[PDB]
Curated annotation (Swiss-Prot), chain B:
Present with 6560 molecules/cell in log phase SD medium. This is NET1-associated nuclear protein 1. Interacts with snoRNA U3. Interacts with MPP10. Component of the ribosomal small subunit (SSU) processome composed of at least 40 protein subunits and snoRNA U3. In the absence of snoRNA3, forms a complex with other t-UTPs. This complex can associate with pre-18S ribosomal RNAs. It is found in: Nucleus, Nucleolus. It comes from Saccharomyces cerevisiae (strain ATCC 204508 / S288c).
UniProtKB/Swiss-Prot annotation, chain E:
It is found in: Nucleus, Nucleolus. Interacts with snoRNA U3. Interacts with MPP10. Component of the ribosomal small subunit (SSU) processome composed of at least 40 protein subunits and snoRNA U3. The lineage of its organism: Eukaryota, Fungi, Dikarya, Ascomycota, Saccharomycotina. The chain holds residues 112 to 167 of 554 of the full protein. This is U3 small nucleolar RNA-associated protein 7. It comes from the Eukaryota. Coiled coil: none annotated. WD repeats lie at residues 1-38. The gene is UTP7.
UniProtKB/Swiss-Prot annotation, chain F:
Pfam families: Ribosomal_L7Ae. Changing residue 55 to A: Impairs binding to U4 snRNA, but not U3 snoRNA. Causes pre-mRNA splicing and pre-rRNA processing defects. It comes from the Eukaryota. The keyword RNA-binding applies. Belongs to the eukaryotic ribosomal protein eL8 family. One of its GO terms (molecular function) is RNA binding. Keywords: mRNA processing, mRNA splicing, Nucleus, Ribonucleoprotein, Ribosome biogenesis, RNA-binding, rRNA processing, Spliceosome. It is found in: Nucleus, Nucleolus. GO terms for biological process: box C/D sno(s)RNA 3'-end processing; maturation of SSU-rRNA; maturation of SSU-rRNA from tricistronic rRNA transcript (SSU-rRNA, 5.8S rRNA, LSU-rRNA); mRNA splicing, via spliceosome; snoRNA guided rRNA 2'-O-methylation; spliceosomal complex assembly. This is 13 kDa ribonucleoprotein-associated protein. The keyword Nucleus applies. Its main location: nucleus. GO terms for cellular component: box C/D methylation guide snoRNP complex; nucleolus; nucleoplasm; nucleus; precatalytic spliceosome; small-subunit processome; spliceosomal complex; U4 snRNP.
Curated annotation (Swiss-Prot), chain H:
This is U3 small nucleolar RNA-associated protein 11. Residues 19-50 are annotated as: Disordered. Signal peptide: none annotated. It comes from Saccharomyces cerevisiae (strain ATCC 204508 / S288c) (Baker's yeast). Involved in nucleolar processing of pre-18S ribosomal RNA. Belongs to the UTP11 family. Component of the ribosomal small subunit (SSU) processome composed of at least 40 protein subunits and snoRNA U3. Interacts with snoRNA U3. Interacts with EBP2, FAF1, MPP10, RPS16A and RRP14.
Length: 102, 48, 188, 431, 56, 121, 387, 50
C-alpha cells in the first residue's frame, strides 16, 4: 500500500494535517513530511532540503516498489544503493552551487 | 588514387570524448586521501 | 617570455621600426612606418609578495598617429581654419588640427543602433568603410544632428557623420537607382 | 588621485603598526586558536611558551622544525618586532616564514601545527604581511575549519578576490569557487611559482598534488571552448608539467602525467611539442606507478595527433630512450590487457621505428600487431616500409612471415601497395 | 594652491591648507582623515587648538 | 521482459504511439509513472501505456495492480525511448496516462485504440 | 648567473603557436567551425517561391534551385558573382525535387530530373530551345504511384555485363518504391516495405574491379528499416529496427557516394560509413555502418537532440565528416554536427545567421560549400575553409 | 448519494476548466481553435520540449 503510492505522497507522507489545511485554504503545502529525518535531508541545507526531499522521495518510491513488487529480489541493497548514489551526487551538485556572486 | 588514400585516412578515425566545462567537476569529492594513480585512472576513465 | 604584443604596427609598412624603453621607466615608446608612434606601460605587479614572477602584461598608454596611406579627400571643418577633415586610402577619416597637433583625432566608425530595432547586417570581423570619394560638411546645425555627408568608393549609399561627437551618424542615404554615389552636397 | 585614496595607501602601508590601544586590541585579537576576548588579554610569553611546546611536538613528528626553533621560534624572537628592522632583515625573516609555511603545509591536520603557527600569526603578523604564502600553502584544506579560521582572520590579497564572500562566513568555499579562483592567469603564474618552490625544496605531498591537478584540469575544462584562453594557458601548465616531471616524486610525476593527458586531449598540440613532452616524460622515469601512467600518457598523447605526420617513425634518440625505459615484454603485456586501451597511432609509430631503427625485433612486431587491430592507413604504412626493408636488406624468415600475416589478412591491400610500388610476381621472386 | 602645513603638538595629526580652499585634518600616520572641507575662498593658514578636536 | 503482460505488436504499437503524439499535442497526457498513478487514483485516465524497457520493471508493475481495480485499460510498448519521443519530451518516458475528455478532438482515436487494447485485455 | 629533461621547456621557449598549422590537419577540428559567407547564390535572379530543392552539379560549378513557382534555375556559382546560367519555367508543374544526374559510363549526359505533385516527371537533357522529355507511364503500376514527388536518382549495374544505367526511384503509396530506367522510363522493379513509407536512400558497395552493388534503404514511419539488394531482383537482404524513433521522416547515408555526393567514375564508388535516421521530434539517431550492418537491432553511436521540431533535411558532407540537420518548421533550425565525435559545432550558426526557415540544403562535391534555401526564396551560400 | 454525484461532476468540470487554463498559460506555441459552436480549444505546435 506504500508501494502503490506516488512519490509526491511519499514526500509529504507524515505531514497530513499541515497538507490538508494548506489545501482546504489556498495556502502553501509542506515539503518535508515524515521524510525530513532522513540523513540526506540532514546533509542538505536551505531550500535544497525541500529539493532533495523531492528527489529522495522519487528514488525512495523507485526502491520501495521494487522491494514490494520484485520476485527475484536478493536482499542485498543493490537498487537502493544505486539510487542512493544518484541522490548523493545530485545533493553534491546542488550543494556545489552558491547564490553569491564570486 | 591519392583521394582514395585521403578518404581512408579520414575514414580511420574513431569517436572520442571531448572535454566539457563540467567533465571534471565531480573529482573534488574524492580527491580526499586517495592515491595519485587512482586519480590518474579516474581521469582516464573520464577521457575515455 | 613575459608577453607578446601582436600587430603593434603594420608589417606592410615596416613592422615595429624603433622601440625603446625610456630609461628608469616602465614605459616603452614604439614607432612604425605606418605614421604612428605609441607608448606602452607596465603596471606594477598584482601579487603583493611575489611580483617578479607575476608580471602584468604591458598595456597601452598615449599615442599619436596620422594616415598610413596618402589622403584622398580634404575639407575644412569650420570658418575659423582650426580643424580639417581628411580621408585617406587606408579607409580612415581623420580630423586634423591646424592649431595644435594633439587635437587631431580619428573620427570613429562605431555604428549607432538601428532605428526600428532590427539587426544591422555586415561582417562580424569589423573593417573600415570603403575609401572616401567625396564629402561635404556644413556646420550650420552642428551638434544638433548629422553634419558631414560622405561618399565612398564603389558603394551605393552615402554615410553621414557628426563632427561634434566625431563619430558616424545614424543615416546612410541610398541612391535608389542601383548606381554608385558620384557626388554629395548639403544645404547651408 | 584623491587625498582619501593616498591616505588609504598609507593605511595599507601602516596596517600592522599599533599606534594606540584600540588598534593594538583590534590587531592582537586576531588569533587562530582563541576568540577575541581571550586573545586580546593574552601576552607574548604565554602564546610563545605553548607555541614552543607545540613546535617540540611538531619537531618530534617531523625533524625539520628544529632549525625554526633555532631562529623563528627562539627566545630572541619574543622581543623581535617586525616593523622596526629594515627591508633586508624583513626579507630575511619573510623567507624564513615562507620556509616554515611550505614545510608545514603538509601538517595542517594535526593541532601542534595550529598552535605553532599561532605564534607566527600573532608575533610576526603573517596573516596580513606574509598572507599570499599562507593562503597558497593551506589552499588544499578549504573544506576544513582551519581554512575557515585563516579566512576569518586574513586580509585578502587582490589576486584571491573571489574568496571575499566566504570571509567571516559559516560555510566553506565550494569547489566551483576554487575553480573560479584558479581560472585567472596571474593566479596561475602565482601558483606555479609556489609549486616551483615546493618542487625545489622537496615538499610536494600527495594531497597537494591531487588538489593542484584537480583544479588545473578543471581550469582546462572551463577554458575548453575558447582557443585564445587555451593558448594563453598552454605555456603555463606545460611549464609546470615540465617542472613536475623534472623531480623525483612518483606522485608529482603522475600529477604531471594527468595534466599533460588532459591538456593534449583538450586541444591539438604540435607534433614537436608532443615529442618533447614524451622525451621529458621518459627522461626521469624511475618508479612503477609512474611507468604505468607514463605508458598510458604517451599512448593518449600520440592518439590526439592529426594530420600528415601522425604515424611517422619516432626518431632514433626518442625511440631508443623509449626502448631503455620500456622493453618488448612491457609493451606486449600492456597490449594484452583486457581493458583495451586505444594505442593505435602510437603502436604504429613504434613498429615503424622498429623497422627503421632495430631490424632484428620483427617477430615481436608480428606478435603485437597480431594482438591489437589497426586501421587501413596504419597497416598500409607498415607494409610500405616493410617493402622498403625487403628492398634494402636480404629478406629472411621474419620478414617473410610478416608478409604471410599481411597476406592472411587484407591481401588486397598488400596487392594495392605492391601495385602502387612494385609487382607481386617480382616480390615473390624477391622473397 | 600651495599647502601650508601644520602638525599637532604631539605628532599624531596633520592639518594642511590649500591656498584655494582645501583644508584637511588627518591622522597622517594611520590613514584616517577626519576633516576634508573645501572652503572655496582663499585660506591662508591653520592651526590646531588644544587637540585634533578643534582647529582654527 | 517476461512479466510485462499485454505487449503490443508493431501495428498496434504504431497506432498507440500515434494517439500518444496527438494527445501530447492536445495536452491530454500525463507522462511519467507518478503522474500516471495520480490519474489512476483520481479516475481521469483513459488508458495507461507502459514501457517494457526499464531495467527494474518493478518500478512499473504496480500500476497494473490499481488498473485492474478501476478496470482501466493498460498496455505495454517495447521502448521507453520511443515512448518519450512520442510524448514529446527529451527524456525517456516509462509510463504515460492519456487523460479523459469529452470535447476532445481525438476522442474517436482514443476510443478506437482503447478498444483495440481491451481486446487483448 | 648563467651563460648559454629540458626538451619540453626548450620547445615551449621556441614555439609561439601551439596548434597544428594549416594543412597538416586533413580532418576537421571539432566544436569550432571555420565558415565564411559568400554572396547569396540566387541573389542575381530572385525566386518567386520557397526553394524546395537544391542540388550542385557533380563536376561543373552549377547549382540548380527549384520550387513551387514551377521554374528551375541553374546558377554558375563562385565567390563573388553567382550568375544565372539558364532558367526553365515548366508551366502547370510545380517542382519539389530536382536532381543533376550524370552517368558513369561516359559522364557526358548531364540530365536534370525534376518532379512535383504530378503524375509525371520531367527530364531535361543539358545541351547549353531545350530538349526535355516527360516520364508519365508506370508500366502497369499506376495505381501504386499517384505522385512523382519523392524520387531519387541512382546508379545500377547489369551484373552480367558491366553496364551501368541510371534508375529513378519513386516513393509510392502503400510501401512501394517503383524503380524505373532513367533513359527509357521502363519499370524495372518494385520494393514494398510494410508500413507507411516515409523516406529512403541509396547505398552502394563495391565488390571487385568494376563491379558494385546497389542497396535501397527504406524506412517505415514506425522505425523499422528494410535494405533491398536491387542489382539482382529487388530482394530484401536485411531488416532491422531503429532504436527509439517513432515518427521517422528522413533517412540518409554518408561518408561514401550518396545520391548527393555522386561518383564520377565507377572505380570511385565507396561504401557509406554513416547512416542518420532523423525523426519528427527532432531526434537524429546516428549509426556507424562499419559495425552496424551485423546486429539487426543495432544501437546508434549517438542520438542528437539539439533542434526540437521535425527533421526535414539531413545531408552528409562529401567527405562524411559533417552531418547537416535542418528543419523547415521553425526559423534558423539548422545544425552542423561534426562526426565521428558526434558533437554539434557551437560557433555556427549564431543568432545572426540569416538562415531563415530552412527548407532545403545542399553540399558542394568539391569546394566545401553549403547552400541553404529558405522559405523566402533565398539560397544563402557559405564556404567551409577546411576544404 | 445522487446529490453527492451532482457535486462531484460539477467539481470535475470546474477543475477541468481550471486545468485547461493553467495548461494554457505555461509556454510553447499555440493557436486558438474554434469549432462549429464556439467551444474554443487551443492546439499546440508539434514541437518537443527542449
Amino acid at each position: 500500500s506504500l508501494a502503490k503510492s506516488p512519490a509526491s505522497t511519499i514526500q509529504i507522507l507524515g505531514a497530513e494535517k499541515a497538507l490538508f489545511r494548506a489545501l482546504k485554504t489556498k495556502h502553501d503545502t509542506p515539503k518535508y513530511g515524515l521524510l525530513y529525518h532522513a540523513s540526506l535531508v540532514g546533509q542538505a541545507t536551505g531550500k535544497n532540503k525541500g529539493k532533495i526531499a523531492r528527489v529522495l522521495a522519487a528514488k525512495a518510491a523507485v526502491s520501495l516498489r521494487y522491494d514490494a513488487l520484485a520476485e527475484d529480489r536478493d536482499d542485498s541493497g543493490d537498487i537502493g544503493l544505486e539510487s542512493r548514489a544518484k541522490v548523493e551526487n545530485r545533493l553534491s551538485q546542488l550543494e556545489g552551487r552558491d547564490l553569491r556572486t564570486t | 588514387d591519392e583521394e582514395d588514400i585521403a578518404l581512408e585516412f579520414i575514414n580511420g578515425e574513431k569517436k572520442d570524448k571531448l572535454v566539457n566545462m563540467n567533465s571534471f567537476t565531480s573529482m573534488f569529492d574524492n580527491i580526499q586521501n586517495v592515491q595519485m594513480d587512482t586519480f590518474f585512472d579516474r581521469v582516464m576513465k573520464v577521457l575515455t | 617570455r613575459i608577453h607578446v604584443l601582436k600587430n603593434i604596427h603594420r608589417e606592410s609598412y615596416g613592422g615595429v621600426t624603433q622601440a625603446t624603453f625610456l630609461n628608469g621607466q616602465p614605459i616603452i615608446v614604439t614607432s612604425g612606418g605606418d605614421n604612428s608612434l605609441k607608448e606602452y606601460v607596465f603596471d606594477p605587479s598584482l601579487s603583493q609578495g611575489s611580483g617578479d614572477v607575476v608580471v602584468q602584461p604591458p598595456r597601452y598608454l598615449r599615442s599619436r598617429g596620422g594616415h598610413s596611406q596618402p589622403p584622398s579627400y580634404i575639407a575644412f571643418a569650420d570658418s575659423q581654419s582650426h580643424f580639417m577633415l581628411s580621408a585617406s586610402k587606408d579607409r580612415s577619416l581623420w580630423s586634423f588640427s591646424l592649431r595644435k597637433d594633439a587635437q587631431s583625432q580619428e573620427m570613429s566608425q562605431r555604428l549607432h543602433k538601428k532605428q526600428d530595432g532590427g539587426r544591422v547586417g555586415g561582417s562580424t570581423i569589423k573593417s573600415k568603410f570603403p575609401e572616401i570619394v567625396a564629402l561635404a560638411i556644413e556646420n550650420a546645425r552642428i551638434g544638433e544632428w548629422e553634419n558631414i555627408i560622405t561618399a565612398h568608393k564603389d558603394e551605393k549609399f552615402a554615410r553621414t557623420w557628426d563632427m561634434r561627437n566625431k563619430r558616424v551618424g545614424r543615416w546612410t542615404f541610398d541612391t535608389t537607382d542601383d548606381g554608385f554615389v558620384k557626388s554629395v552636397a548639403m544645404s547651408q | 588621485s584623491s587625498l582619501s585614496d593616498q591616505l588609504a595607501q598609507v593605511a595599507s602601508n601602516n596596517a600592522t603598526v599599533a599606534l594606540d590601544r584600540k588598534r593594538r586590541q583590534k590587531l592582537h585579537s586576531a588569533s587562530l586558536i582563541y576568540n577575541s576576548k581571550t586573545a586580546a588579554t593574552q601576552d607574548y610569553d604565554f602564546i610563545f611558551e605553548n607555541a614552543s611546546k607545540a613546535l617540540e611536538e611538531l619537531s618530534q613528528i617531523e625533524p625539520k622544525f628544529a632549525i625554526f626553533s633555532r631562529t623563528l621560534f627562539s627566545e630572541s624572537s619574543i622581543s623581535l618586532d617586525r616593523n622596526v628592522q629594515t627591508k633586508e632583515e624583513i626579507k630575511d625573516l619573510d623567507n624564513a616564514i615562507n620556509a616554515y609555511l611550505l614545510l608545514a603545509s603538509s601538517k595542517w591536520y594535526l593541532a601542534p601545527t595550529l598552535h605553532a603557527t599561532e605564534w607566527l600569526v600573532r608575533r610576526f603578523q603573517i596573516h596580513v604581511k606574509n598572507t599570499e604564502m599562507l593562503l597558497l600553502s593551506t589552499l588544499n584544506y578549504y573544506q576544513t575549519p582551519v581554512f575557515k579560521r585563516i579566512l576569518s582572520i586574513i586580509k585578502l590579497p587582490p589576486l584571491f578576490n573571489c574568496l571575499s564572500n566566504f570571509v567571516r562566513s559559516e560555510k566553506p568555499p565550494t569547489a566551483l569557487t576554487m575553480i573560479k579562483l584558479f581560472n585567472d592567469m596571474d593566479f596561475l603564474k602565482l601558483y606555479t611559482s609556489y609549486l616551483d618552490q615546493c618542487i625545489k625544496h622537496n615538499a610536494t605531498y600527495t594531497n597537494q598534488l591531487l588538489f593542484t591537478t584537480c583544479c588545473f584540469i578543471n581550469v582546462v575544462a572551463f577554458n575548453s571552448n575558447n582557443d585564445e584562453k587555451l593558448n594563453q594557458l598552454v605555456p603555463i601548465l606545460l611549464e609546470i608539467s615540465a617542472k613536475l616531471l623534472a623531480s623525483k616524486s612518483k606522485d608529482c610525476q603522475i600529477a604531471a602525467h594527468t595534466i599533460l593527458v588532459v591538456f593534449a586531449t583538450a586541444l591539438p598540440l604540435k607534433k614537436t611539442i608532443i615529442l618533447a613532452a614524451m622525451e621529458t616524460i621518459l627522461s626521469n622515469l624511475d618508479a612503477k606507478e609512474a611507468k604505468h601512467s607514463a605508458l598510458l600518457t604517451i599512448c593518449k598523447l600520440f592518439q590526439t595527433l592529426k594530420g600528415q605526420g601522425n604515424v611517422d617513425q619516432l626518431p632514433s634518440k626518442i625511440f631508443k630512450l623509449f626502448d631503455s625505459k620500456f622493453d618488448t615484454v612491457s609493451i606486449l603485456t600492456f597490449l594484452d590487457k583486457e581493458d583495451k586501451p586505444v594505442c593505435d597511432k602510437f603502436i604504429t609509430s613504434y613498429t615503424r621505428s622498429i623497422a627503421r631503427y632495430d631490424r632484428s625485433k620483427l617477430n615481436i612486431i608480428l606478435s603485437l600487431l597480431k594482438k591489437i587491430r589497426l586501421e587501413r592507413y596504419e597497416v598500409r604504412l607498415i607494409i610500405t616500409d616493410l617493402i622498403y626493408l625487403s628492398e634494402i636488406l636480404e629478406d629472411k624468415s621474419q620478414l617473410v612471415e610478416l608478409f604471410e600475416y599481411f597476406i592472411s589478412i587484407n591481401e588486397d591491400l598488400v596487392l594495392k601497395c605492391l601495385k602502387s610500388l612494385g609487382l607481386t610476381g617480382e616480390l615473390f621472386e624477391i622473397r | 594652491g600651495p599647502y601650508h602645513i601644520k602638525y599637532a603638538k604631539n605628532g599624531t595629526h596633520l592639518l594642511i591648507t590649500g591656498r584655494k580652499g582645501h583644508v584637511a585634518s588627518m591622522d597622517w600616520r594611520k590613514g584616517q582623515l577626519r576633516a576634508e572641507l573645501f572652503l572655496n575662498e582663499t585660506c591662508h593658514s591653520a592651526t590646531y587648538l588644544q587637540n585634533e578636536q578643534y582647529f582654527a | 521482459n517476461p512479466k510485462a503482460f499485454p505487449l503490443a505488436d508493431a501495428a498496434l504499437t504504431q497506432q498507440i504511439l500515434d494517439v500518444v503524439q496527438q494527445a501530447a499535442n492536445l495536452r491530454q497526457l500525463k507522462k511519467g509513472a507518478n503522474e500516471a498513478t495520480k490519474t489512476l487514483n483520481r479516475g481521469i485516465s483513459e488508458f495507461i501505456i507502459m514501457a517494457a524497457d526499464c531495467e527494474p520493471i518493478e518500478i512499473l508493475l504496480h500500476l497494473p495492480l490499481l488498473c485492474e481495480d478501476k478496470n482501466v485499460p493498460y498496455v505495454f510498448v517495447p521502448s521507453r525511448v520511443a515512448l518519450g519521443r512520442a510524448c514529446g519530451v527529451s527524456r525517456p518516458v516509462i509510463a504515460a496516462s492519456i487523460t479523459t475528455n469529452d470535447a476532445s478532438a481525438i476522442k474517436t482515436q482514443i476510443y478506437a485504440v482503447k478498444d483495440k487494447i481491451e481486446t487483448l485485455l | 648567473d648563467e651563460s648559454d629533461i629540458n626538451a619540453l621547456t626548450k620547445i615551449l621557449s621556441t614555439t609561439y603557436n601551439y596548434k597544428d598549422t594549416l594543412s597538416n590537419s586533413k580532418l576537421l577540428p571539432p566544436k569550432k567551425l571555420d565558415i565564411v559567407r559568400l554572396k547569396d547564390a540566387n541573389a542575381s535572379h530572385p525566386s518567386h517561391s520557397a526553394i524546395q530543392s537544391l542540388s550542385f552539379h557533380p563536376s561543373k560549378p552549377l547549382l540548380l534551385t527549384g520550387g513551387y513557382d514551377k521554374t528551375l534555375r541553374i546558377y554558375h556559382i563562385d565567390g563573388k558573382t553567382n550568375h544565372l546560367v539558364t532558367s526553365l519555367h515548366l508551366v502547370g508543374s510545380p517542382i519539389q525535387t530536382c536532381t543533376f544526374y550524370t552517368s558513369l559510363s561516359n559522364q557526358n549526359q548531364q540530365n536534370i530530373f525534376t518532379a512535383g505533385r504530378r503524375r509525371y516527371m520531367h527530364s531535361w537533357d543539358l545541351s547549353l530551345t531545350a530538349k526535355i522529355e516527360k516520364f508519365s507511364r508506370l508500366y502497369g503500376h499506376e495505381s501504386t504511384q499517384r505522385s512523382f514527388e519523392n524520387f531519387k536518382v541512382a546508379h545500377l549495374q547489369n551484373s552480367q555485363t558491366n553496364s551501368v544505367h541510371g534508375i529513378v526511384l519513386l516513393q509510392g503509396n502503400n510501401g512501394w518504391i517503383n524503380i524505373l530506367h532513367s533513359t527509357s522510363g521502363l519499370w524495372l522493379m518494385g520494393c514494398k516495405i510494410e508500413g507507411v513509407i516515409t523516406d529512403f536512400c541509396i547505398d552502394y558497395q563495391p565488390i571487385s574491379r568494376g563491379k558494385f552493388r546497389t542497396i535501397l534503404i527504406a524506412v517505415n514511419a514506425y522505425g523499422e528499416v528494410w535494405e533491398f539488394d536491387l542489382n539482382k531482383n529487388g530482394h530484401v537482404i536485411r531488416r532491422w529496427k531503429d532504436q527509439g524513433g517513432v515518427g521517422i521522416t528522413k533517412i540518409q547515408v554518408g561518408g561514401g557516394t550518396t545520391t548527393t555526393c555522386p561518383a564520377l567514375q565507377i572505380s570511385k564508388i565507396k561504401q557509406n560509413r554513416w547512416l542518420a535516421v532523423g525523426s519528427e521530434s527532432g531526434f537524429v539517431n546516428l549509426y556507424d555502418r562499419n559495425n552496424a550492418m551485423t546486429s539487426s537491432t543495432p544501437t546508434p553511436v549517438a542520438a542528437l537532440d539539439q533542434l526540437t521540431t521535425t527533421i526535414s533535411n539531413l545531408q552528409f558532407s562529401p567527405d562524411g565528416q559533417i552531418l547537416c540537420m535542418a528543419s523547415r518548421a521553425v526559423k534558423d533550425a539548422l545544425r552542423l554536427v561534426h562526426l565521428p565525435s558526434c558533437s554539434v559545432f557551437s560557433n555556427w550558426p549564431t543568432s545572426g545567421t540569416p538562415l531563415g526557415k530552412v527548407t532545403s540544403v545542399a553540399f558542394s562535391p568539391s569546394g566545401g560549400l553549403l547552400a541553404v534555401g529558405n522559405e523566402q526564396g533565398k539560397v544563402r551560400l557559405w564556404k567551409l575553409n577546411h576544404y | 448519494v445522487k446529490q453527492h454525484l451532482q457535486r462531484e461532476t460539477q467539481l470535475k468540470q470546474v477543475q477541468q476548466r481550471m486545468d485547461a487554463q493553467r495548461e494554457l498559460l505555461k509556454k510553447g506555441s499555440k493557436k486558438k481553435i474554434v469549432d462549429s459552436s464556439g467551444k474554443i480549444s487551443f492546439k499546440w505546435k508539434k514541437q518537443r520540449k527542449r
